[PDB]
Assembly symmetry: C2
Homo-oligomer: 358 residues x 2
């Protein structure tokens, strides 16, 4: 009747799958909540904030998960091959809930299967209305979009808003968002509230409506229209990274050579190759007088807000299956969100694309 | 006449006392404009951009200031004892306009005086309505206030604006601006733009009205501290901006106060160079103490060099323009002018203002 949350061990990860308010709800459901010491420090969540909420602190990940019936993590557990065998720390037959990156991480699913662990890959949450509150892709990408604007403004040597002053007028910055998904949408909104002239481009002609509702201008030869804007653009933000596929090239370095010195490019797709071939994971590349920034775990750059949201997504997914009167958890297998996220259970891999080498 | 602008040499200074726009006005005023090669690189001002405006590019600094009758700079020239006497490069009898930091640097003033160079300490610009467009302290501090918010949001692990999503409502960040001068005002405006709830505190009451006009809330109630601390314990980003003329910055956030703040909170100390409004700040560093980040970046306006330079150059232009004589067809600084009298610290091999 124990749920455990370890500290994230993968490099670049500062989020944690828990928050004081979720600890309280979990305790209210009848759970004993165990958190590894310092697991939330990166997200501004102290051990004492956790214990005040009802959680108990374990000194290590092994002790935290030793007798846990349920384990909540942010990123998929590490296998012996990657260093620390976290999969081994999960009790055989236990339940794991996390962003498993299942589709592109067959080895982790196999490792979990050997220990007969039931794993729910949160990133596979079905796209149904009643599941939006359990959607981790949505909650994290939204913060990533906001963060993109903050990092761009930070690296930019000019101020974003137009300023009328006694010494003259400070022109507003011009921003061009590539890709109008959850992240792109928030980038537009944040770049807009900061005072910039915001442009946006996306192949899906259905996005123009959303861009305009936020006060942005949709760019309507096509590459010629984008280029005309790009050469005037101060901050270019790309957000097109389609899972299970290389990031689409949206800004060639030929185009970057046409940009104005001092410009900034935020490449949120650097992880999959980047929408700009010049971006490098975890670095800020200075080329042709342009800064090409490609930070690695953007939502982690907003860890303090990302963590509580991630914990809530998890809580919303688990809550419907808990009988707080008997203090028992029974994941209803017929529930669409359960069957949809389960990739392995009782020693059997259930996702069709992860049973062998394709 | 000839006016020259060199590259700023002091460490970390990326601003330049020139802009293509101001170059056009100078040429139109009858000036021959010369700029040191790559002087505007840090300000996104290319040599070709300046050439297009009508300026001449000198390969070196010496070559730029050699025959200059007027010299414009951002920071005071360096004295011989400090690596390179940029002073020795300024033609004797020439005119210099820049942030001289005169009232705290006698050595630079004497070095200029020995060369019979007339120097106008722009930072001494009189606080009169007429000089607003010539005031470098206001133009640079305005951008500093903006930058403080950017740097704070950058170091903050949360989002500034309130966000209502499918996963719930996340409250907006809470900002507390200490000192409502030019910098403080911009910090409030920018913090507001980003969606934060903004509180402010300053000894002047005439500032409450200004704060409210921007959407900010004025902290009010002897023990003003109690009211302040009450807001500080809920604050996510504290921005301090109080600087006293040539004196140690007043202390506004004690270490004791810092220990009462929320983990992950951020403090931007814009007064770090003058001692800091917070005793935990260190010039050029981000200190973590009691779970709080105390940020003390130096030369904040340079963190906004591409916008700071155009404005700084305009302040200089606005100050110089009224003194071109449409008779000697040259530059004659009117001695009776309130701004000339208020900024000159040394003239023709004499001292100024004692």
């Amino acid at each position: 009747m124990k749920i455990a949350i370890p500290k994230e061990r993968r490099p670049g990860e500062d989020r944690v799958a828990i928050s004081p308010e979720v600890v309280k709800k979990l305790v209210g459901l009848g759970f004993e909540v165990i958190v590894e010491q310092g697991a939330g420090v990166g997200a501004s969540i102290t051990d004492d904030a956790l214990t005040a909420a009802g959680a108990t602190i374990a000194s290590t990940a092994a002790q935290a998960l030793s007798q846990a019936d349920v384990v909540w993590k942010v990123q998929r557990p590490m296998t012996a091959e990657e260093g620390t065998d976290e999969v081994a720390l999960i009790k055989e037959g236990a339940v794991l809930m996390c962003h498993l990156g299942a589709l592109t991480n067959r080895p982790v699913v196999e490792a979990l299967t050997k220990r007969k662990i039931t794993a729910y890959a949160m990133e596979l949450m079905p796209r149904i209305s009643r599941a939006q509150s359990m959607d981790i892709l949505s909650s994290q990408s939204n913060l990533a979009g906001y963060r993109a604007v903050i990092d761009g403004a930070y690296e930019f040597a000019r101020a974003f808003p137009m300023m009328m002053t006694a010494a003259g007028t400070v022109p507003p910055a011009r921003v061009l968002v590539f890709g109008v998904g959850v992240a792109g949408l928030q980038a537009i909104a944040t770049a807009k509230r900061l005072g910039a002239v915001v442009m946006a481009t996306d192949v899906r002609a259905a996005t123009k409506e959303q861009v305009e509702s936020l006060g942005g201008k949709f760019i309507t030869k096509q590459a010629e229209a984008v280029l005309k804007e790009l050469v005037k653009t101060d901050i270019a933000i790309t957000t097109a990274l389609i899972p299970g596929k290389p990031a689409p090239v949206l800004i060639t370095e030929e185009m970057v050579t046409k940009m104005k010195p001092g410009s900034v490019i935020i490449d949120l797709a650097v992880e999959a190759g980047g929408n700009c071939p010049l971006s490098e994971p975890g670095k800020i590349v200075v080329k042709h007088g342009v800064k090409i920034v490609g930070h690695t775990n953007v939502p982690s750059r907003v860890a303090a807000d990302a963590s509580p949201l991630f914990a809530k997504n998890l809580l919303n997914f688990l809550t419907p299956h808990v009988d707080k009167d008997t203090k028992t958890l029974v994941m209803k297998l017929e529930d669409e969100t359960v069957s949809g996220t389960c990739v392995t259970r009782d020693g059997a891999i259930v996702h069709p694309a992860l049973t062998g080498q394709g």
